[PDB]
Amino acid sequence: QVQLVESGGGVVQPGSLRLSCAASGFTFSGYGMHWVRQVPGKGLEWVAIIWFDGSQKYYADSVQGRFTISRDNKKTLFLRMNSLRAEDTAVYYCAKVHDDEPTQDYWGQGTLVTVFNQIKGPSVFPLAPSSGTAALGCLVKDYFPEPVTVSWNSGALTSGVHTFPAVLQSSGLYSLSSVVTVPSSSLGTQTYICNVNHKPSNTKVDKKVEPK
Amino acid sequence: NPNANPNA
Amino acid sequence: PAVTTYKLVINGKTLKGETTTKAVDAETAEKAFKQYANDNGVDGVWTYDDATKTFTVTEH
Amino acid sequence: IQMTQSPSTLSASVGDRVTITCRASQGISTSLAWYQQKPGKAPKLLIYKASSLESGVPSRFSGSGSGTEFTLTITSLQPEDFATYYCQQYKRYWTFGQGTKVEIKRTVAAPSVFIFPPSDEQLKSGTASVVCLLNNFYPREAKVQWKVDNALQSGNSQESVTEQDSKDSTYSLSSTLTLSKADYEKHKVYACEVTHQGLSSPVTKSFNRGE
Protein backbone atom coordinates (compact mmCIF):
# COMPACT_ATOMS: atom_id res chain seq x y z
CA GLN A 1 0.00 0.00 0.00
CA VAL A 2 3.07 2.22 -0.40
CA GLN A 3 1.65 5.36 -2.05
CA LEU A 4 3.28 8.69 -2.93
CA VAL A 5 0.87 11.43 -4.05
CA GLU A 6 2.58 14.54 -5.41
CA SER A 7 1.16 18.03 -5.78
CA GLY A 8 2.15 21.68 -5.89
CA GLY A 9 3.55 21.76 -9.42
CA GLY A 10 2.67 24.42 -11.94
CA VAL A 11 3.99 27.41 -13.87
CA VAL A 12 6.02 30.25 -12.35
CA GLN A 13 8.25 33.19 -13.32
CA PRO A 14 12.08 33.28 -13.16
CA GLY A 15 9.46 32.98 -8.40
CA SER A 16 8.67 30.46 -5.66
CA LEU A 17 6.82 27.15 -5.44
CA ARG A 18 6.45 24.30 -2.95
CA LEU A 19 5.89 20.68 -3.99
CA SER A 20 4.20 18.20 -1.65
CA CYS A 21 4.51 14.42 -1.36
CA ALA A 22 1.91 12.60 0.76
CA ALA A 23 3.24 9.23 1.90
CA SER A 24 1.11 6.28 2.98
CA GLY A 25 1.32 2.52 3.32
CA PHE A 26 4.57 2.60 5.32
CA THR A 27 6.05 4.21 8.43
CA PHE A 28 7.15 7.51 6.88
CA SER A 29 9.01 8.59 10.03
CA GLY A 30 11.52 5.74 9.74
CA TYR A 31 12.83 6.24 6.19
CA GLY A 32 14.64 8.98 4.33
CA MET A 33 13.19 10.46 1.15
CA HIS A 34 14.47 11.82 -2.15
CA TRP A 35 13.60 14.37 -4.79
CA VAL A 36 14.59 13.42 -8.35
CA ARG A 37 13.77 15.48 -11.44
CA GLN A 38 13.60 14.44 -15.09
CA VAL A 39 13.77 16.89 -17.99
CA PRO A 40 11.25 15.80 -20.65
CA GLY A 41 13.16 13.80 -23.24
CA LYS A 42 16.20 13.53 -20.95
CA GLY A 43 17.42 11.25 -18.17
CA LEU A 44 17.12 11.37 -14.40
CA GLU A 45 18.93 13.81 -12.12
CA TRP A 46 18.89 13.76 -8.32
CA VAL A 47 18.07 16.94 -6.42
CA ALA A 48 17.99 16.48 -2.63
CA ILE A 49 17.83 14.01 0.26
CA ILE A 50 17.14 14.33 3.99
CA TRP A 51 17.30 11.69 6.71
CA PHE A 52 14.35 10.28 8.60
CA ASP A 53 15.75 12.64 11.25
CA GLY A 54 15.89 15.94 9.41
CA SER A 55 19.47 16.29 10.65
CA GLN A 56 21.48 15.77 7.45
CA LYS A 57 20.50 17.82 4.39
CA TYR A 58 22.34 17.26 1.12
CA TYR A 59 21.59 18.98 -2.18
CA ALA A 60 22.95 18.77 -5.71
CA ASP A 61 25.41 21.37 -7.00
CA SER A 62 22.67 23.00 -9.09
CA VAL A 63 19.87 23.60 -6.54
CA GLN A 64 22.08 24.59 -3.60
CA GLY A 65 20.74 27.68 -1.87
CA ARG A 66 17.44 27.71 -3.78
CA PHE A 67 15.42 24.58 -3.06
CA THR A 68 15.05 23.40 0.53
CA ILE A 69 13.98 19.89 1.56
CA SER A 70 11.74 19.44 4.61
CA ARG A 71 9.29 16.99 6.14
CA ASP A 72 6.43 17.04 8.66
CA ASN A 73 6.37 13.46 9.95
CA LYS A 74 1.52 14.97 8.51
CA LYS A 75 3.67 12.26 6.85
CA THR A 76 4.48 14.62 3.97
CA LEU A 77 7.67 15.50 2.07
CA PHE A 78 8.19 19.08 0.87
CA LEU A 79 10.49 20.91 -1.53
CA ARG A 80 10.10 24.69 -1.34
CA MET A 81 11.47 25.82 -4.71
CA ASN A 82 12.74 29.42 -4.71
CA SER A 83 14.67 31.56 -7.21
CA LEU A 84 13.67 29.20 -10.00
CA ARG A 85 16.02 29.17 -12.99
CA ALA A 86 15.31 28.12 -16.57
CA GLU A 87 17.13 24.78 -16.40
CA ASP A 88 14.83 23.59 -13.57
CA THR A 89 11.90 22.77 -15.89
CA ALA A 90 11.31 19.09 -15.21
CA VAL A 91 8.91 16.55 -13.77
CA TYR A 92 9.73 16.28 -10.07
CA TYR A 93 9.57 12.84 -8.41
CA CYS A 94 9.67 12.20 -4.68
CA ALA A 95 11.15 8.81 -3.81
CA LYS A 96 11.56 6.58 -0.76
CA VAL A 97 14.87 4.99 0.33
CA HIS A 98 15.18 1.20 0.36
CA ASP A 99 15.69 -0.81 3.55
CA ASP A 100 19.06 -2.44 2.89
CA GLU A 101 20.79 -0.19 0.42
CA PRO A 102 20.56 3.65 0.41
CA THR A 103 18.80 4.14 -2.91
CA GLN A 104 15.30 4.85 -4.18
CA ASP A 105 12.68 2.10 -4.40
CA TYR A 106 9.21 3.69 -4.57
CA TRP A 107 8.54 6.84 -6.60
CA GLY A 108 5.76 9.40 -6.69
CA GLN A 109 3.53 10.13 -9.67
CA GLY A 110 5.55 13.28 -10.37
CA THR A 111 4.19 16.79 -10.92
CA LEU A 112 5.46 19.15 -13.61
CA VAL A 113 7.37 22.35 -12.85
CA THR A 114 7.52 24.85 -15.73
CA VAL A 115 9.51 28.09 -15.52
CA PHE A 116 8.45 30.58 -18.19
CA ASN A 117 11.10 33.17 -19.07
CA GLN A 118 9.25 35.07 -21.80
CA ILE A 119 6.02 33.78 -23.33
CA LYS A 120 5.91 33.57 -27.13
CA GLY A 121 2.93 32.27 -29.09
CA PRO A 122 3.43 30.19 -32.23
CA SER A 123 3.86 31.01 -35.89
CA VAL A 124 1.77 28.59 -37.94
CA PHE A 125 2.88 27.93 -41.51
CA PRO A 126 1.34 25.48 -43.99
CA LEU A 127 3.01 22.36 -45.35
CA ALA A 128 1.11 22.44 -48.64
CA PRO A 129 0.54 19.25 -50.66
CA SER A 130 1.52 18.83 -54.30
CA SER A 131 0.83 7.20 -54.86
CA GLY A 132 -2.86 8.15 -54.84
CA THR A 133 -2.07 9.62 -51.36
CA ALA A 134 -0.85 13.12 -50.57
CA ALA A 135 0.79 14.47 -47.43
CA LEU A 136 0.15 17.88 -45.87
CA GLY A 137 0.67 19.51 -42.54
CA CYS A 138 1.48 22.51 -40.38
CA LEU A 139 4.79 23.78 -39.08
CA VAL A 140 4.26 25.31 -35.62
CA LYS A 141 7.40 27.37 -35.09
CA ASP A 142 8.96 29.78 -32.60
CA TYR A 143 6.88 29.29 -29.46
CA PHE A 144 7.82 29.12 -25.78
CA PRO A 145 7.36 27.44 -23.44
CA GLU A 146 6.04 23.98 -24.13
CA PRO A 147 3.59 22.62 -25.02
CA VAL A 148 1.43 23.14 -28.09
CA THR A 149 -1.37 20.82 -29.17
CA VAL A 150 -2.45 20.26 -32.78
CA SER A 151 -5.72 18.87 -34.06
CA TRP A 152 -7.00 18.60 -37.62
CA ASN A 153 -10.42 19.85 -38.71
CA SER A 154 -11.32 20.48 -35.06
CA GLY A 155 -10.75 16.80 -34.31
CA ALA A 156 -12.79 15.29 -37.15
CA LEU A 157 -9.56 14.18 -38.87
CA THR A 158 -7.50 11.80 -36.71
CA SER A 159 -6.45 8.82 -38.84
CA GLY A 160 -3.09 9.20 -40.56
CA VAL A 161 -2.05 12.07 -38.27
CA HIS A 162 1.51 12.33 -36.94
CA THR A 163 2.31 15.18 -34.55
CA PHE A 164 6.05 15.08 -33.97
CA PRO A 165 7.96 15.86 -30.76
CA ALA A 166 9.03 19.48 -30.57
CA VAL A 167 12.69 20.39 -31.06
CA LEU A 168 14.43 23.25 -29.28
CA GLN A 169 15.95 25.64 -31.80
CA SER A 170 19.17 27.62 -31.41
CA SER A 171 17.00 30.67 -30.68
CA GLY A 172 15.71 29.05 -27.48
CA LEU A 173 12.23 28.63 -29.02
CA TYR A 174 10.46 25.39 -29.87
CA SER A 175 9.30 24.07 -33.22
CA LEU A 176 7.12 21.13 -34.15
CA SER A 177 5.35 19.81 -37.20
CA SER A 178 2.05 18.00 -37.56
CA VAL A 179 1.28 16.09 -40.75
CA VAL A 180 -1.49 13.93 -42.15
CA THR A 181 -1.88 11.80 -45.27
CA VAL A 182 -5.15 12.02 -47.22
CA PRO A 183 -6.46 10.95 -50.62
CA SER A 184 -4.93 13.18 -53.27
CA SER A 185 -8.30 13.18 -55.05
CA SER A 186 -9.91 14.96 -52.07
CA LEU A 187 -7.53 17.93 -52.23
CA GLY A 188 -9.97 19.91 -54.37
CA THR A 189 -13.22 19.25 -52.51
CA GLN A 190 -12.18 18.82 -48.84
CA THR A 191 -10.76 21.51 -46.57
CA TYR A 192 -7.88 20.77 -44.20
CA ILE A 193 -7.41 23.02 -41.18
CA CYS A 194 -4.92 22.50 -38.40
CA ASN A 195 -6.05 23.87 -35.01
CA VAL A 196 -3.14 24.96 -32.83
CA ASN A 197 -3.38 25.69 -29.09
CA HIS A 198 -0.68 27.29 -26.94
CA LYS A 199 -2.15 27.72 -23.46
CA PRO A 200 0.81 29.76 -22.05
CA SER A 201 -0.07 32.55 -24.51
CA ASN A 202 -3.79 31.63 -24.68
CA THR A 203 -3.36 31.15 -28.43
CA LYS A 204 -6.08 29.24 -30.29
CA VAL A 205 -5.59 29.57 -34.04
CA ASP A 206 -6.76 27.69 -37.12
CA LYS A 207 -4.54 27.51 -40.21
CA LYS A 208 -6.17 26.38 -43.46
CA VAL A 209 -3.62 24.42 -45.52
CA GLU A 210 -4.32 25.12 -49.20
CA PRO A 211 -3.01 22.89 -52.01
CA LYS A 212 -0.48 24.00 -54.61
CA ASN B 1 28.39 11.56 4.06
CA PRO B 2 25.31 11.81 1.84
CA ASN B 3 25.20 8.08 1.01
CA ALA B 4 25.05 6.80 4.57
CA ASN B 5 21.78 4.96 5.31
CA PRO B 6 19.24 7.72 6.03
CA ASN B 7 16.78 5.26 7.57
CA ALA B 8 16.10 3.96 11.09
CA PRO C 1 4.74 48.12 -13.24
CA ALA C 2 1.30 46.49 -13.29
CA VAL C 3 0.22 44.97 -16.61
CA THR C 4 -3.18 43.82 -17.88
CA THR C 5 -4.20 41.21 -20.45
CA TYR C 6 -5.14 42.22 -24.00
CA LYS C 7 -6.65 40.02 -26.70
CA LEU C 8 -6.05 39.78 -30.45
CA VAL C 9 -8.59 38.40 -32.90
CA ILE C 10 -6.97 37.32 -36.16
CA ASN C 11 -9.11 37.40 -39.30
CA GLY C 12 -6.55 36.26 -41.86
CA LYS C 13 -7.11 34.77 -45.29
CA THR C 14 -5.97 31.32 -44.07
CA LEU C 15 -5.03 31.97 -40.41
CA LYS C 16 -7.96 32.64 -38.06
CA GLY C 17 -8.23 32.58 -34.31
CA GLU C 18 -7.12 34.44 -31.22
CA THR C 19 -4.10 35.12 -29.04
CA THR C 20 -3.30 37.23 -25.98
CA THR C 21 -0.49 39.31 -24.48
CA LYS C 22 0.26 41.21 -21.28
CA ALA C 23 1.33 44.85 -21.56
CA VAL C 24 1.42 48.00 -19.47
CA ASP C 25 -1.12 49.71 -21.77
CA ALA C 26 -3.03 49.22 -25.01
CA GLU C 27 -0.60 50.70 -27.55
CA THR C 28 2.26 48.54 -26.25
CA ALA C 29 0.09 45.44 -26.62
CA GLU C 30 -0.69 46.45 -30.21
CA LYS C 31 3.05 46.49 -30.95
CA ALA C 32 3.37 42.92 -29.64
CA PHE C 33 0.30 41.80 -31.61
CA LYS C 34 1.62 43.45 -34.78
CA GLN C 35 4.85 41.50 -34.33
CA TYR C 36 2.83 38.31 -33.76
CA ALA C 37 0.75 38.89 -36.89
CA ASN C 38 3.90 39.78 -38.87
CA ASP C 39 5.58 36.56 -37.68
CA ASN C 40 2.58 34.70 -39.13
CA GLY C 41 2.71 36.53 -42.47
CA VAL C 42 -0.56 38.39 -41.81
CA ASP C 43 -0.77 42.12 -42.59
CA GLY C 44 -4.12 43.86 -42.29
CA VAL C 45 -6.30 46.65 -40.96
CA TRP C 46 -6.00 47.23 -37.21
CA THR C 47 -9.03 47.93 -35.01
CA TYR C 48 -9.52 48.05 -31.26
CA ASP C 49 -12.52 47.43 -29.00
CA ASP C 50 -12.02 49.50 -25.86
CA ALA C 51 -14.72 47.67 -23.89
CA THR C 52 -13.39 44.15 -24.48
CA LYS C 53 -9.74 45.27 -24.74
CA THR C 54 -9.65 43.28 -27.98
CA PHE C 55 -7.63 44.13 -31.09
CA THR C 56 -8.59 42.76 -34.50
CA VAL C 57 -6.31 42.49 -37.53
CA THR C 58 -8.27 41.98 -40.76
CA GLU C 59 -6.35 40.72 -43.79
CA HIS C 60 -7.23 41.97 -47.28
CA ILE D 1 30.85 8.73 -11.14
CA GLN D 2 28.95 8.35 -14.41
CA MET D 3 27.23 5.34 -15.96
CA THR D 4 27.28 4.32 -19.62
CA GLN D 5 24.67 1.86 -20.92
CA SER D 6 24.83 -0.26 -24.06
CA PRO D 7 22.96 -0.34 -26.28
CA SER D 8 20.86 2.84 -26.20
CA THR D 9 18.05 1.15 -28.14
CA LEU D 10 17.21 -2.38 -29.25
CA SER D 11 14.36 -4.17 -31.02
CA ALA D 12 13.05 -7.49 -29.72
CA SER D 13 10.06 -9.82 -29.92
CA VAL D 14 7.93 -11.39 -27.19
CA GLY D 15 9.67 -14.42 -25.70
CA ASP D 16 13.17 -13.14 -26.52
CA ARG D 17 16.13 -13.06 -24.16
CA VAL D 18 17.34 -9.45 -23.94
CA THR D 19 20.52 -8.18 -22.29
CA ILE D 20 21.41 -4.65 -21.12
CA THR D 21 24.92 -3.71 -19.99
CA CYS D 22 26.09 -0.85 -17.79
CA ARG D 23 29.68 0.39 -17.40
CA ALA D 24 30.57 2.54 -14.39
CA SER D 25 33.41 5.03 -14.15
CA GLN D 26 35.33 4.12 -10.97
CA GLY D 27 34.48 0.89 -9.15
CA ILE D 28 31.18 0.77 -7.27
CA SER D 29 31.41 -2.84 -6.05
CA THR D 30 27.76 -3.98 -6.04
CA SER D 31 26.14 -0.58 -5.29
CA LEU D 32 24.14 -0.67 -8.53
CA ALA D 33 20.40 -0.56 -9.23
CA TRP D 34 18.29 -1.12 -12.34
CA TYR D 35 15.08 0.84 -12.95
CA GLN D 36 12.23 0.59 -15.45
CA GLN D 37 10.21 3.54 -16.73
CA LYS D 38 7.43 3.78 -19.28
CA PRO D 39 6.64 7.12 -20.95
CA GLY D 40 4.81 9.55 -18.68
CA LYS D 41 5.15 7.23 -15.67
CA ALA D 42 7.42 7.12 -12.65
CA PRO D 43 10.42 4.75 -12.68
CA LYS D 44 10.21 1.43 -10.86
CA LEU D 45 13.01 -0.39 -9.05
CA LEU D 46 13.84 -3.79 -10.55
CA ILE D 47 17.24 -4.79 -9.14
CA TYR D 48 19.31 -3.48 -6.25
CA LYS D 49 22.77 -4.48 -5.02
CA ALA D 50 23.54 -5.53 -8.62
CA SER D 51 21.67 -8.83 -8.23
CA SER D 52 18.94 -8.64 -5.54
CA LEU D 53 15.37 -8.66 -6.87
CA GLU D 54 12.98 -6.10 -5.41
CA SER D 55 9.73 -7.56 -4.08
CA GLY D 56 6.92 -7.84 -6.61
CA VAL D 57 9.30 -7.82 -9.59
CA PRO D 58 8.72 -10.76 -11.98
CA SER D 59 11.25 -13.59 -11.84
CA ARG D 60 12.31 -13.03 -15.46
CA PHE D 61 14.41 -9.99 -14.44
CA SER D 62 17.92 -10.63 -13.12
CA GLY D 63 21.07 -8.60 -12.55
CA SER D 64 24.77 -9.52 -12.68
CA GLY D 65 28.21 -8.00 -12.35
CA SER D 66 30.50 -6.35 -9.83
CA GLY D 67 33.04 -3.55 -9.93
CA THR D 68 32.42 -1.51 -13.09
CA GLU D 69 30.50 -3.75 -15.53
CA PHE D 70 26.93 -4.90 -14.94
CA THR D 71 24.25 -6.76 -16.88
CA LEU D 72 20.45 -6.69 -16.70
CA THR D 73 18.90 -9.81 -18.24
CA ILE D 74 15.22 -10.29 -19.12
CA THR D 75 14.07 -13.82 -19.94
CA SER D 76 11.04 -14.38 -22.17
CA LEU D 77 10.27 -10.72 -22.84
CA GLN D 78 6.64 -9.84 -22.11
CA PRO D 79 4.52 -7.20 -23.89
CA GLU D 80 4.58 -5.09 -20.70
CA ASP D 81 8.41 -5.11 -20.75
CA PHE D 82 8.74 -2.80 -23.76
CA ALA D 83 10.07 0.25 -21.91
CA THR D 84 13.24 2.16 -21.00
CA TYR D 85 15.71 0.76 -18.48
CA TYR D 86 18.22 2.71 -16.39
CA CYS D 87 21.18 1.54 -14.37
CA GLN D 88 22.24 3.61 -11.39
CA GLN D 89 25.09 3.79 -8.89
CA TYR D 90 24.55 4.79 -5.28
CA LYS D 91 28.15 4.73 -4.05
CA ARG D 92 28.68 8.51 -4.28
CA TYR D 93 25.44 10.49 -4.61
CA TRP D 94 23.15 8.96 -7.28
CA THR D 95 24.06 8.71 -10.97
CA PHE D 96 21.98 7.21 -13.78
CA GLY D 97 22.92 5.83 -17.17
CA GLN D 98 21.57 7.23 -20.41
CA GLY D 99 18.83 4.59 -20.60
CA THR D 100 18.11 1.64 -22.90
CA LYS D 101 14.81 1.68 -24.81
CA VAL D 102 13.49 -1.79 -25.67
CA GLU D 103 11.22 -1.50 -28.72
CA ILE D 104 9.00 -3.89 -30.65
CA LYS D 105 10.57 -5.69 -33.60
CA ARG D 106 8.71 -6.03 -36.90
CA THR D 107 9.51 -6.54 -40.57
CA VAL D 108 11.47 -3.92 -42.46
CA ALA D 109 9.27 -1.21 -44.00
CA ALA D 110 10.64 1.50 -46.27
CA PRO D 111 9.61 5.13 -45.66
CA SER D 112 7.34 7.19 -47.85
CA VAL D 113 9.16 10.46 -48.51
CA PHE D 114 7.70 13.93 -49.09
CA ILE D 115 9.24 17.39 -49.29
CA PHE D 116 7.57 20.73 -48.54
CA PRO D 117 8.94 24.08 -49.74
CA PRO D 118 8.76 27.04 -47.36
CA SER D 119 5.53 29.02 -47.40
CA ASP D 120 5.19 32.53 -48.77
CA GLU D 121 3.78 33.53 -45.37
CA GLN D 122 7.04 32.50 -43.68
CA LEU D 123 9.27 33.91 -46.43
CA LYS D 124 7.60 37.28 -45.79
CA SER D 125 9.59 37.54 -42.54
CA GLY D 126 13.06 36.53 -43.75
CA THR D 127 13.36 32.82 -42.91
CA ALA D 128 12.90 29.69 -45.02
CA SER D 129 12.04 26.34 -43.42
CA VAL D 130 12.18 23.37 -45.79
CA VAL D 131 10.62 20.16 -44.47
CA CYS D 132 11.10 16.52 -45.45
CA LEU D 133 8.67 13.86 -44.20
CA LEU D 134 9.59 10.20 -43.70
CA ASN D 135 6.39 8.26 -43.07
CA ASN D 136 5.67 4.88 -41.46
CA PHE D 137 9.02 3.12 -41.70
CA TYR D 138 10.86 0.39 -39.78
CA PRO D 139 13.48 0.18 -38.31
CA ARG D 140 13.97 3.54 -36.62
CA GLU D 141 17.41 4.21 -38.16
CA ALA D 142 16.74 6.44 -41.16
CA LYS D 143 19.19 8.96 -42.63
CA VAL D 144 18.02 12.30 -44.03
CA GLN D 145 20.58 14.21 -46.11
CA TRP D 146 19.71 17.72 -47.30
CA LYS D 147 21.25 18.95 -50.55
CA VAL D 148 21.14 22.51 -51.91
CA ASP D 149 22.28 22.71 -55.54
CA ASN D 150 24.01 19.37 -54.87
CA ALA D 151 25.97 20.80 -51.91
CA LEU D 152 25.64 18.63 -48.81
CA GLN D 153 24.18 20.49 -45.83
CA SER D 154 25.28 20.07 -42.25
CA GLY D 155 24.53 21.80 -38.97
CA ASN D 156 21.48 23.68 -40.29
CA SER D 157 18.78 21.01 -39.89
CA GLN D 158 16.82 19.42 -37.05
CA GLU D 159 14.95 16.12 -36.75
CA SER D 160 12.32 14.55 -34.53
CA VAL D 161 10.86 11.05 -34.57
CA THR D 162 7.52 9.76 -33.37
CA GLU D 163 7.16 6.93 -30.90
CA GLN D 164 6.41 3.49 -32.29
CA ASP D 165 2.85 3.46 -33.62
CA SER D 166 0.10 1.66 -31.70
CA LYS D 167 -1.06 -0.51 -34.59
CA ASP D 168 1.78 -1.13 -37.08
CA SER D 169 4.87 -0.47 -34.89
CA THR D 170 6.39 1.93 -37.45
CA TYR D 171 8.11 5.27 -37.00
CA SER D 172 7.80 8.60 -38.76
CA LEU D 173 10.39 11.37 -38.94
CA SER D 174 10.24 15.11 -39.63
CA SER D 175 13.37 17.06 -40.61
CA THR D 176 13.47 20.85 -40.94
CA LEU D 177 16.22 22.61 -42.91
CA THR D 178 16.31 26.27 -41.87
CA LEU D 179 17.95 28.92 -44.09
CA SER D 180 17.76 32.67 -44.17
CA LYS D 181 15.50 33.99 -46.91
CA ALA D 182 18.50 35.63 -48.60
CA ASP D 183 20.37 32.32 -48.63
CA TYR D 184 17.23 30.51 -49.78
CA GLU D 185 16.81 32.85 -52.78
CA LYS D 186 20.43 32.22 -53.81
CA HIS D 187 19.79 28.59 -54.77
CA LYS D 188 17.48 26.55 -57.00
CA VAL D 189 17.43 22.80 -56.24
CA TYR D 190 16.37 21.72 -52.74
CA ALA D 191 16.49 18.00 -52.07
CA CYS D 192 16.27 15.59 -49.17
CA GLU D 193 17.90 12.22 -49.79
CA VAL D 194 16.78 9.31 -47.63
CA THR D 195 18.81 6.21 -46.80
CA HIS D 196 17.07 3.30 -45.11
CA GLN D 197 17.47 -0.46 -44.90
CA GLY D 198 14.11 -0.86 -46.63
CA LEU D 199 15.37 1.01 -49.70
CA SER D 200 17.58 -0.72 -52.25
CA SER D 201 18.92 2.70 -53.26
CA PRO D 202 18.47 6.11 -51.63
CA VAL D 203 15.30 8.03 -52.41
CA THR D 204 15.54 11.72 -53.23
CA LYS D 205 12.62 14.14 -53.18
CA SER D 206 13.42 17.58 -54.55
CA PHE D 207 11.93 20.77 -55.91
CA ASN D 208 13.11 23.88 -57.73
CA ARG D 209 12.62 27.14 -55.85
CA GLY D 210 9.74 28.54 -57.89
CA GLU D 211 6.98 25.91 -58.31
Numbering used by the authors:
A (entry chain H): 1 to 14, 16 to 52, 52A, 53 to 73, 75 to 82, 82A, 82B, 82C, ...
B (entry chain P): 1 to 8
C (entry chain G): 3 to 62
D (entry chain L): 2 to 94, 96 to 213
Article, verbatim:
The vaccine is based on PfCSP, which densely covers the surface of sporozoites and plays a critical role in the P. falciparum life cycle from the development of sporozoites in the mosquito midgut to liver-stage development in humans. The repeat region in P. falciparum is composed of 1 NPDP, 3-5 NVDP, and 35-41 NANP repeats. In this work, we characterize eight monoclonal antibodies (mAb) derived from protected volunteers who participated in a phase 2a clinical trial of RTS,S/AS0131 with a delayed fractional dosing regimen, and compare them with three previously published mAbs derived from the same clinical trial. Co-crystal structures also reveal conserved and convergent use of aromatic residues for interaction with the NANP repeat region.
